[PDB]
Amino acid sequence: VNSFSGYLKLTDNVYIKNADIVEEAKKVKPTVVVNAANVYLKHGGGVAGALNKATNNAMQVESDDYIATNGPLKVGGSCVLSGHNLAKHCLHVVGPNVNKGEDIQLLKSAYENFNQHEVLLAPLLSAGIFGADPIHSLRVCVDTVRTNVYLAVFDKNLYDKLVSSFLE
Numbered sequence: 387v388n389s390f391s392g393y394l395k396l397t398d399n400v401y402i403k404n405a406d407i408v409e410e411a412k413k414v415k416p417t418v419v420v421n422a423a424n425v426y427l428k429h430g431g432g433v434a435g436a437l438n439k440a441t442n443n444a445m446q447v448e449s450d451d452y453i454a455t456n457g458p459l460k461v462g463g464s465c466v467l468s469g470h471n472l473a474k475h476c477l478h479v480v481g482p483n484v485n486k487g488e489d490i491q492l493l494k495s496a497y498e499n500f501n502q503h504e505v506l507l508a509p510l511l512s513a514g515i516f517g518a519d520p521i522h523s524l525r526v527c528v529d530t531v532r533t534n535v536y537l538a539v540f541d542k543n544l545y546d547k548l549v550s551s552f553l554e
């Protein structure tokens with residue numbers, strides 16, 4: 387139903403909340419939930435692990451069948467698969483992992499995938515153990531995405547830092 391609540395409005399199309407993306411998906415029932423995926427769709431840790439465990443491993447089983455016949459994605463690319471019990475669809479987006487040496491310029495391409503969907507629930511791409519500067523990831527989101535994006539950031543200190551930095 388795309389019924390989002392409790393978000394701060396940063397721009398006319400970008401919203402942010404201190405929340406777990408899994409709990410937001412259960413409450414909102416969005417048309418699209420974004421996963422911060424890797425190229426072979428191995429959802430072991432972080433955001434991808436939280437989403438997969440909330441589907442009771444259905445997301446990993448579907449992702450393994452997709453990779454067996456289609457092979458890996460590219461950095462900056464995306465794949466629409468089922469959203470299972472969390473959303474109508476899951477948009478698996480691969481942002482660059484700068485801690486593993488990948489190019490930060492590809493973060494723009496990663497966010498450009500969001501423009502194919504009118505409204506999305508999403509994490510902050512390439513943050514956490516992917517190592518991108520989170521303030522820079524928020525700036526790329528704001529400058530690239532034109533559709534309605536609801537960012538769930540599950541860390542109060544990081545949320546407060548992002549909001550303070552944006553309001554400078």
Ligand SMILES: CC(C)[C@H](Nc1ncnc2[nH]cc(C(=O)NC3CC3)c12)c1ccc2c(c1)S(=O)(=O)CCC2
Pocket residue numbers: 405406407408422431432433434436509510511512513514515516538539540541544
């Ligand atoms: C910056 C984080 C606060 C954020 N995490 C989250 N953000 C929003 N809903 C979440 N639910 C569980 C989370 C989660 O990370 N759960 C683990 C047990 C810690 C979580 C996040 C944002 C983007 C990325 C990652 C992590 S990652 O997985 O480290 C690498 C991929 C990019």
